[PDB]
Amino acid sequence: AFLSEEMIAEFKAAFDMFDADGGGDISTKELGTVMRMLGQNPTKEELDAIIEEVDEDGSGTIDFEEFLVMMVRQMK
């Protein structure tokens, strides 16, 4: 009925290109790489606040469910 399709499909396109697992999880350094490709500078305060509050699935490996909730609200 009412959903955001243009920005969600562009976040998934950069995520699947920079893949650690395949279509599910990307690495801790690849979170900063995808943010530069879309339109957001990964600063020391932004990177610290995102991996510490929004957890890493394994050791340093962020997944798309918690990633898409924090990335759509901050860089909209």
Swiss-Prot record:
Q: What residues does the EF-hand domain cover?
A: 6-41, 42-76
Highest taxon of the lineage: Eukaryota
Q: Which residues bind Ca(2+) 1?
A: 19, 21, 25, 30
Q: Where does Ca(2+) 2 bind?
A: 55, 57, 59, 61, 66
Return the similarity comment: Belongs to the troponin C family.
Q: What does this protein do?
A: Troponin is the central regulatory protein of striated muscle contraction. Tn consists of three components: Tn-I which is the inhibitor of actomyosin ATPase, Tn-T which contains the binding site for tropomyosin and Tn-C. The binding of calcium to Tn-C abolishes the inhibitory action of Tn on actin filaments.
Q: Share any extra remarks.
A: Skeletal muscle troponin C binds four calcium ions.
Name of the protein described by the UniProt record: Troponin C, skeletal muscle
Native source species: Meleagris gallopavo
User: Which gene codes for it?
Assistant: TNNC2
Q: Which residues of the full protein are shown?
A: 12 to 87 of 162
